[PDB]
Each structure stands twice: as C-alpha cells, then as structure tokens.
Write a structure and sequence with these properties.
The structure is cut from a larger assembly and holds chains A, B, C and D. Chain B is α+β, with helices and mostly antiparallel strands. Chain B has three helices and seven strands, in the order ββαβββαβαβ. Chain C is an alpha+beta fold. Chain C folds into two domains: 85 residues, Outer Surface Protein A, domain 3 (Alpha-Beta Complex); 106 residues, Ribosomal protein L6 (Outer Surface Protein A, domain 3). The radius of gyration of chain C is 20 Å and the shape is elongated. The relative contact order of chain C is 0.17. Classes of the chains: A alpha+beta, B alpha+beta, C alpha+beta, D mainly alpha. Bound molecules: potassium ion and magnesium ion (13 copies). Chain D binds four RNA strands through β1, α1, α2, α3 and α4. Chain D: This is Large ribosomal subunit protein uL13A.
Chain lengths: 136, 172, 191, 197
RNA sequence: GGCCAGCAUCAGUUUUGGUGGCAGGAUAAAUCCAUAGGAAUGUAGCUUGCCUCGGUAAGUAUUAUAGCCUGUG
RNA sequence: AGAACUGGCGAUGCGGGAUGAACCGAACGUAGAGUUAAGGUGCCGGAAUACACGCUCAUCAGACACCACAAAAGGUGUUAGUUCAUCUAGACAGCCGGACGGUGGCCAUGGAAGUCGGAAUCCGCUAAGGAGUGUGUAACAACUCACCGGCCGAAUGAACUA
RNA sequence: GCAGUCAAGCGUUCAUAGCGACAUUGCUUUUUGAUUCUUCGAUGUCGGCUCUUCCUAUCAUACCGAAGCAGAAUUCGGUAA
RNA sequence: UUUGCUCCACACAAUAUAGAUGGAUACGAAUAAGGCGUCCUUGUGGCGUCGCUGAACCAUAGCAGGCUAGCAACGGUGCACUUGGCGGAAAGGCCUUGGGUGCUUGCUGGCGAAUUGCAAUGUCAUUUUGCGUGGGGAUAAAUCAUUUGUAUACGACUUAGA
C-alpha cells in the first residue's frame, strides 16, 4: 500500500564530512571538509592527525561515513575543537575499515619468526575449527 | 606557462641628467618564475608607456603570497584575449583559495574553451568578490547556497593489479 | 555547466503505490499496474512522505537535466494511467468512400480492420496492443475510442491506426481521407 | 599469477581488454576469455554496425577468398582486435596467440573455474555514465553470427547449475563462518589477532 | 700454470635512496594568540503563524547556548 | 618557370617524421657505462591505461609542423563570453476576455472599406487598440495579431562573439 | 564540367513551388590547356567488337518529402548503384 | 606377416619442452547499486553489517622433509578400492557412500643430519618415442592390375568381379 523507493545512501561532500587522504604527504590521515570550493575541490583541515589546512582535489581523498557538526569555513582551532568534541578518531578506529587498515599494517610489520608463529597458531586453531565443523 | 606565482615588478625608465628619479611604474604579473615575470612586465610596459628594457631597468621584483591562502574566495577575473579572428574582453568567475590558483584555473579554462594560449591572454584584473549577490555567474552561484551538500555517484576506484576477482562496485 | 543538483517532484495520489527498485518503477492504482524500466537515464529516486517522490540528477549536464524532467513526466503519466486512465478518440474522415472500421480476431489477436479506405480493395489490419480496449462510439458519427492504462500504448495504437490510413500518390491537402486522433484525454471524467 | 587466467568478458570494452590480453600473452601468460558475446564496444550499436560494414566491404577484388576474412562471431571479433595488437606474423606473436583461447559463453572446462575481470578494461569503470555502448553478441548477430540463441540457452542452463552450486557453497560458508565465529574468544585466536590474523 | 666465478677493501665514471646543518623572502605568507571594527550562505536568544513528537517558515537579533570576515599588533 | 641571402641534399650514414634525397635532431674510428636531442610512453613498441582543469558524441568524429587538402555560408547541438533590454509596483511562455469610435481616413481602380498599390503615420474612449500583423471577400461582412487584461508565480528576452 | 552562399528581380499577388541578376565560395579530373618528373639499348600509337568490375554527379525500377500536387501527366528534392 | 597389432603395469633407454617450481580459489545480476547475515506479513519488504581491493582466502614446520616413543581427539589429509547420483557447449569433470591402510606439526619427547668444504638450477616437472619383461584383448582392408560409363584431357569419379 505504501510506496517503496530504495534509498541509495551516498556519502555527501559537506562541511564536517570526514575524509581519508590516500595520496600526498598525509597518505592515510583523516581530515574534515572545511568547505566546498568546486564540484571537484574542497578545502579540508586535519589538525588532529597533522594534515595542514589545504585545498585538495576530491580525487585525492576518500569520503568516510563519519560526519561531525562544523560551521562552514571554520578555522583550524575550531576544527580541532569540534573534532575532539565529536571524538572522530575513536569513531573511525571503531570501524572495520580502520580495523582492516591496521590489520594490514600489522601483517606488513610482522617478522619471519612472527610469521612462523602465525602458521603454528593457525594450524592449532584450524584443528579445533575443523573438529567443530565435523561435529556439526 | 606553469604553476603560477604572483610578482610585483617595479621598473624605472632609466634616469638621465635631465630627469633623475623617474616615475617608478609597478605591475602585478602572474608568472612561473622571475625571468618570465620581468619579461611580461617589459611586454606590458612597452604596451603602455614609451620605454623598453634597453632604456629602462627593473627596480624591484617581489613575490606576493596570498594573504589568506586557506580561505575560499570567489574571484572576478577580467581578461582580454585574442581569438582566431579578433580580440575580445571577457569576465569570468573562479572559486579558489588564492590568486595564483584562480589564475591557473583561468588559463586552463581559456585554453579549454576558447583555445586561447598563454601568449594570447592578458590578465586585465583579478579581484575578490567580497559580497555574495555580487557574484553574477551561475557556475559559482550554485556553490554559494546554504548547507551545500552533494554526493559523488559512480566512484571508480583504480586497481593496482591487472586482474580483479570481485566484479567491483561503484558505490560511494 | 554541470548543475550540482536538479530535482523534480512526483505527486502520488491516495490510491497509488509506487515501488521503485534500482530504476524499475511499478505504479499500482485503482485501474491496474504499470511498469517501466528507466535504467537508461541515471537518475536517483527518493520517497519523501508517501505522497511525494523526488527524482534528482547530481552534477548533470543540459541533456541530463532535460532527461530528468522527461523521467518525471513519464512517471506522472504512469500514475495518471493507473488513476484516471487514458482515452484517445479518433474520427474517420472521408469525402466519398465510407471507411469501414471493425474489430476482428485472427488466432485471438484482436486486429482492427479498415476496409474501403479511399475505395481500396486492400484490407488494413492494425493489431490491438495488450491493455488497449477499442470501443466504437455511439452518439458520434465515425468515432473509434482507445482506452487503457498506458498512454504510450494507447497513443501508439492510435498512431498505428492513423498511419495505416495514409494517402499515397495524391495531393493529401485535397484527399484528406484518414483516421485522425481528434481528442486525447482521460477515461475518468473531470478527475 | 595463475597458470591460466580466465577472464569473464562481460562488459569489458573490447579494445582495452584486448590490449591487456596482448600484453599478458606477449609476457607469457595463458589467457582464456569467456562470454565474448557479452563484450562491450563504446559508441552506438548503429555506429559499430556501420564500422563492421565498412570492414566487410574490404576484400581482395580479384578473389574474395584471398581478402581479409570477416569473422562474425564475438570471440573472433575480439580475436581480430587482439591479433591486430599482437605482432602475429612472427614466431613470437604466433606463440603468444597459441597462449590464448576465446569462447562464446563458458564451455565445460572453464565453467567450474574462477573468472576474473580487468578493471582497467571494465565498461562501468571506464565509460562516462550516459555514454552509449554496443553489445558484441547483438553486433555479431546483426552482421551474420548464427549462434546467439544456442549460446543464450546453454548460458541459462549453466547459470542454473552455477546457482545451485553457489547456494550449496553459501550454505557451507555460513556453516564455516559460524564455526570460526566460535573459538574466536579462544586464546589461540587472541594471539592470532595480536599478530594480525 | 690456464678457464669460470664469489667476497672484501679501494680507484675512475655514474645511477638511486636515508639523513644533518645553514641562508633568503613581507627576516615567507599562513596557522596560533591578542585586539578593534563588521555582515551573513544570520549562531544563540526574542517575535509572529502552524502542527503528527516537536519543530518549522518569515522577521529581529552581530556572539550569545556556533562561528566567520577585514584591519592592527 | 626565374632571381637574392643562408642552410642543406648531391657527397650522408645515424635517431625521429609508419613509409620518403632535402624536414626535426644530430653528423659517423672500434667498444663499455651514463645522460639526452627530436620524437614518443593503451597494444603492436622500449617507456605513466600518469596526474590535473575543461571541451567534444559525429548514421562520413578526431587524433601532431614539412605532409600528403578543404571554403563561403549555416545549426535553441553543446560551451564560454559581449552589449542592450523586461522583471515580485508580477519578467517570458501557457489557457480564456476584449481588440472600439471618429472611419469605407485620402488617393490611384471596373470594384480596394486597415490589409494587390502611393502618401498621410492622427487622436477620443482609453489598462488598450496599428488608418493596421496575417487569414479570408469580386468589394463586403467575418476570424487573427500587434495592444491591454483574468489565472500561475522568478527569472526572462534580443542581437551578437568564438 | 558539376555544386553551393547572398537575394535585385521572374513567378498575376508572392525573393526562395520552380527559377534567379550583380557578386562570391567551392568541388571534380570523363574537356582542353600549362608543365616536362617517368619512359627514346622501344610501356604497341584511333575507333569498334568482347568481357568483368568499380564510381554516383540517379535515366529507369523500390520507398518517400515538396509543388504554382484536383485527377492524369509533370517538375524539384531525399535514401538509394 | 620372416611372431605381426593393440591395451594395461613395471623396468631401462632415448626424446624434447614459447618455459611448473604451494593452490586457475566456479553464482547471477546491478553499478544513480549491490554481497552477506537475520526476521517476518515472503516483498522492488524490515533490520544489522561489509566494501574504500587478492594487502585476500586456503595452504604452509619435519633427511626435497628420515627413524622412532607417547598424550589428546575421532578430526584433517594421501592412496588403492568402493556406493550412488549428476554433468554433452569442447561432457572426460563434480558431488557422494562405506570400509581398509599410510601420514598428521593438535600437544609433548629421543635419535639422525656435518666434509656439496663460503655460492654455483646443483638436477625432484611433463612430452613423445623405442625396447624388454608380465597380464588382457582383436584376427582387416585399401591401392595397382581387370571391369563399368551415371565420369573423364591425364589424374580423379562412379560401378562390377572368389
Ligand atoms: K620512348
Ligand atoms: Mg498525380
Ligand atoms: Mg555467409
Ligand atoms: Mg666506488
Ligand atoms: Mg626545370
Ligand atoms: Mg652528380
Ligand atoms: Mg644530412
Ligand atoms: Mg607521415
Ligand atoms: Mg660510442
Ligand atoms: Mg611496453
Ligand atoms: Mg565556419
Ligand atoms: Mg615491348
Ligand atoms: Mg605491355
Ligand atoms: Mg547520391
């Protein structure tokens, strides 16, 4: 009886939208859209992570699902204050996306002895998991 | 010609015994380096006053940095350019954080839309539009609306590897 | 210019439900169900308040934003078809030879038969598209009426009937014989 | 890094896919292309049909059996692009071409193998939205390919069988994921997570 | 003895990284801090009309329960 | 086809222009290493399916000088501009109402009343009406538009430039 | 040789149904010239007969648009070899 | 047929390799949308979650992986078998039943390794063929010559002949 229309939720280019830099001097740090210059350009600020206030191409960043309240054009001090108040860093670190990034960094940081230990532990866990699967 | 810097260039029309201390003419030149800046200064000075580089001298050249390079501004740019069949004055509007970025955008846009090379363009004036509703171009007006939001549909991620195993998605 | 956002509104009356998957629209109303595939336009649908659907184009050029209003008109015509219906009345026009229009069946296909058009011995057959109902109207001389949910199918049937009766090898300013759409409106009166 | 790479050609921008395949073949990689009838060409279907008719009118005047051969099948059209971009008259190019197989649909040997895509050749990733494009199967049928319908029938049958296979695999994967969700609060799982696994 | 190599320490040529200390500019411009003055894509408050929680639409209000701009230091 | 200055080919390989006496780069003993020139870097093919801002969709697209062709004239295709206009004291478009009187204004014509033609280019009522924008009449009569209105409510129109 | 653009005029009225002055932009290489690059230790020099193929600037046939297309006839034009 | 032919198994020989050196690891569809999990009123449904690449998943320790002693658990895996089903697009593969036997690094022990000398691919794969030894299996044609004329320059074709 009621109309059904699929939402198709997009992440929005907006003031307060949190982005992740994928290329440049930041290369993996979070910033906030201070304001929108053009359809392809935004002024961003990353004071908590160390990203300098800069006009950046939208193709140089990835929009995150994280947004916090921020007035348009807010200077670096205001951006840092609102960022801390909204606890953007904790919200990001809780996401599986950041968890995947940290996991791949840890795997890259593993040494040869740690890889051997990973193999041994994986075999130990696999034994129990296969036993449970057979019991099921 | 490259990523642009703005220079103040002050030239003298070299003094003589009859006329010491000439009138010290200054301009703001957008150029990628000081050599090009001085060349352009002498080009425009030869367009304006009876003087040439041989009969004058550059008193000073100073790079002018943006006062607020991290404040988003709307710029009105008045240019004069040569097309294939004539000369035309044009006014355009560019949103950016600095005069040099706005001028680079202006040169890119003029090359893209009018095939006007650097040699064919004169920057008559660049001035920040301080007040909204003095912006008279729609392609800048539409970015001045309150609480401006827009999605980025059809995100195309670049693959690092030749082959993918996932049949990727363009969600954003 | 690449306008940032362009939007159109689609009012949904009380008896109508619009189911919009990715770009497949199913409009259901008192008169039936209409379905349309719009995967060729790249628009975005959003339900606002169960009586209003917004259709939007983001970062769209001139042709894209024109197709946006085209989409809005198409969905509006779907809703109109399921609420009021669409009916086209065509008149038979002839100077000497009376045009004989009937409904016949050929393996259960419901053709419209045109005989004696300009005295032709050829018999013209126009299949009736599914969902279109043909009625030969009384109280008006030489009127055929095509009724249905889809304005597209109704108007295409009327157009086929009109085009099958085109005059050849004659000054069509003088030989005005044919079957011409005289009225296009809705099945329900004054809705 | 596979001994054989199977590319599902659906929606794959025949020229860009062919460039990828030519480079892989010349570098020594065995490539098997399936579903060539679902390859895409940018531009209107009428544009590409006119282009194929321009190709068709070219033939050796004194003997048409000598002239350029106009293969109609989608796999052979993709092969024509690939051969035009491989140095096929040399022994190295010939060996590269023997390193390649192109199929309409997905025949028995490869229907049970993994299919990959080439993102730099994918139509949805490359073409601007709204740009018109052609389907190789439709173009081939319009220019004389005779086996669109039988390929479609066999593809429907293969898709039914593959859907049954994937339903079974999804049930088994749900079971396995349930079993791995348990023993994730185990000490071994804790050490693995500390090490990043 | 001859043939083919490996390593180390050097020499000539060169290629590609990591890192330290200085100099200059508007003794960078910025950020930041302080301060003065403002308007708005007008924040809090206040006023008017609405009603399905409770907000909304229009006014007034220049920092207040957001901020921003310019000048100066 | 004939002169001037220079550089070249002849007499000259090499890299580039696919190919080519003359063009670009560079002139050459036999080798090694490095860097380049002109030219290039999807694949052929060595080298970024590089980055960035735009523009273009062509049922004959276009794709690097010499060089292997295209013009005048056009196009609410699309883009960006110039100048002048209308507009919340209601812009344009859309539907409906009016569109008079003096007046068949004067004259040429067999007849011509606003409307085959010349001149005169006026006002009263006027929100408004032209001695007339068209259709129609043998001339009439009659529809039609300029012009003004009723309804909706914010941007719109014209001539140009490339 | 063929094709455009402008539009003073023709076309009873009406520039563009069909035409179209004064001008002007082109295309073609089935004219004839211009040139002398190839061939003078030799490319058999007219035309016809025969036979194949190609082009389209389409005479006819197919389907159409326009007319100063009532019909008939005809004219202009489009896709089309 | 001067013991022929063929299939299998092993052994020994040659023969080369467009180029193995952990695993080609299987939905379909869409991309201005989807995958998965869950729930119900089973839908173009609600809810939750994921992506932002395979940077994965599986595998992976032991004289190139030896010989042995246990513990825990009835798992994992190899093998020859075996039960049944499915697969014709090029099926030549997929799934499955039961038992036997080997290994298990799931955990804890004991012994061995050296001298290839400071590296040398330091030889581990698959591709054909030959030959020998064992076992199983089968026991023809075609061409020439002759003949036919539905054929024909000659070849070829098309007929016939114990
Ligand atoms: K001669
Ligand atoms: Mg006729
Ligand atoms: Mg055939
Ligand atoms: Mg050295
Ligand atoms: Mg000469
Ligand atoms: Mg000589
Ligand atoms: Mg030379
Ligand atoms: Mg060339
Ligand atoms: Mg040398
Ligand atoms: Mg290469
Ligand atoms: Mg032109
Ligand atoms: Mg001879
Ligand atoms: Mg001869
Ligand atoms: Mg033609």
């Amino acid at each position: 009886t009621d109309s059904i229309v699929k939402a198709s939720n997009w992440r929005l280019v907006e003031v307060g939208r949190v982005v992740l830099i994928k290329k440049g001097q930041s290369a993996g740090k979070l910033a906030a859209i201070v304001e929108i210059i053009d359809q392809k350009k935004v002024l961003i600020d990353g004071p908590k992570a160390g990203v300098p206030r800069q006009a950046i191409n939208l193709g140089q960043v990835v929009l995150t699902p994280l947004t916090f309240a921020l007035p348009r054009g807010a200077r670096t001090a205001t951006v840092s204050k609102k960022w801390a108040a909204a606890a953007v860093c904790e919200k990001w670190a809780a996401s599986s996306w950041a968890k995947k990034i940290a996991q791949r960094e840890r795997r890259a940081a593993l040494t040869d002895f740690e890889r051997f230990q990973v193999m041994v532990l994986r075999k130990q866990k696999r034994y129990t998991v296969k036993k449970a699967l057979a019991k099921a | 010609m490259a990523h642009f810097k703005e220079y103040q260039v002050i030239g003298r029309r070299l003094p003589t015994e009859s006329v010491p201390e000439p009138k010290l003419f200054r301009m703001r030149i957008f150029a990628s380096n000081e050599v090009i800046a001085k060349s352009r200064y002498w080009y425009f000075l030869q367009k304006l006053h009876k003087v040439k580089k041989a009969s004058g001298e550059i008193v000073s050249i100073n790079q002018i940095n943006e006062a607020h390079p991290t404040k988003v501004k709307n710029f009105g740019v008045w240019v004069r350019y040569d097309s294939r069949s004539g000369t035309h004055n044009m006014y355009k509007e560019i949103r950016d954080v600095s005069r040099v970025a706005a001028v680079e955008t202006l040169y890119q846009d003029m090359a893209a839309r009018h095939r006007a090379r650097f040699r064919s363009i004169h920057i008559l004036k660049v001035a920040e539009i301080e007040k909204t509703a003095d912006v008279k171009r729609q392609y800048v007006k539409q970015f001045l609306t309150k609480d401006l939001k827009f999605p980025l549909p059809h995100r195309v991620q670049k693959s690092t590897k030749t082959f993918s195993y996932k049949r990727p998605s363009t969600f954003y | 210019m690449k306008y940032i956002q362009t939007e159109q509104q689609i009012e949904v009356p009380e008896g109508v439900t619009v189911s919009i998957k990715s770009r497949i629209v199913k409009v259901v109303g008192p008169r039936g169900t209409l379905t349309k595939n719009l995967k060729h336009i790249d628009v975005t649908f959003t339900k606002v308040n169960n009586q209003l659907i917004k259709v939007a184009v983001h970062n769209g050029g001139r042709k894209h934003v024109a197709a946006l209003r085209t989409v809005k008109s198409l969905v509006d015509n779907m809703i109109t078809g399921v609420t009021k219906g669409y009916k086209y009345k065509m008149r038979y026009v002839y100077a000497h030879f009376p045009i004989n229009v009937n409904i016949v069946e050929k393996d259960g296909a419901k053709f419209i038969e045109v005989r004696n058009f300009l005295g032709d011995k050829k018999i013209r057959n126009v299949p009736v598209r599914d969902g279109v109902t043909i009625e030969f109207s009384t109280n008006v001389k030489d009127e055929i009426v095509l009724s249905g949910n889809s304005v597209e199918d109704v108007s295409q049937n009327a157009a086929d009937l009109q085009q099958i009766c085109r005059v050849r090898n004659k000054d069509i300013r003088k030989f005005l014989d044919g079957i011409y759409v005289s009225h296009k409106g809705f099945i329900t009166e004054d809705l | 890094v596979e001994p054989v790479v199977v590319i599902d050609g659906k929606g794959h921008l025949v020229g860009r896919l062919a460039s990828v395949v030519a480079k892989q073949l010349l570098n020594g990689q065995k490539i098997v292309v399936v579903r060539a009838e679902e390859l895409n060409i940018s531009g209107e279907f009428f544009r590409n049909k006119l282009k194929y008719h321009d190709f068709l009118r070219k033939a050796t005047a004194f003997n048409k059996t000598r002239g350029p051969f106009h293969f109609r099948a989608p796999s052979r059209i993709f092969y024509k692009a690939l051969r035009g971009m491989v140095s096929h008259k040399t022994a190295r190019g010939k060996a590269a071409l023997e390193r390649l197989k192109v199929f309409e649909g997905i025949p028995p040997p490869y229907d049970k193998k993994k299919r990959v895509v080439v993102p730099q050749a994918l139509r949805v990733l490359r073409l601007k939205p709204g740009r018109k494009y052609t389907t190789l199967g439709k173009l081939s049928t319009s220019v004389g390919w005779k086996y669109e319908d039988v390929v479609a029938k066999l593809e429907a049958k293969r898709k039914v069988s593959s859907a049954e296979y994937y339903a079974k695999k999804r049930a088994f994967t749900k079971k396995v994921a349930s079993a791995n969700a348990t023993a994730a609060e185990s000490d071994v799982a804790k050490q693995l997570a500390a090490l990043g696994y």
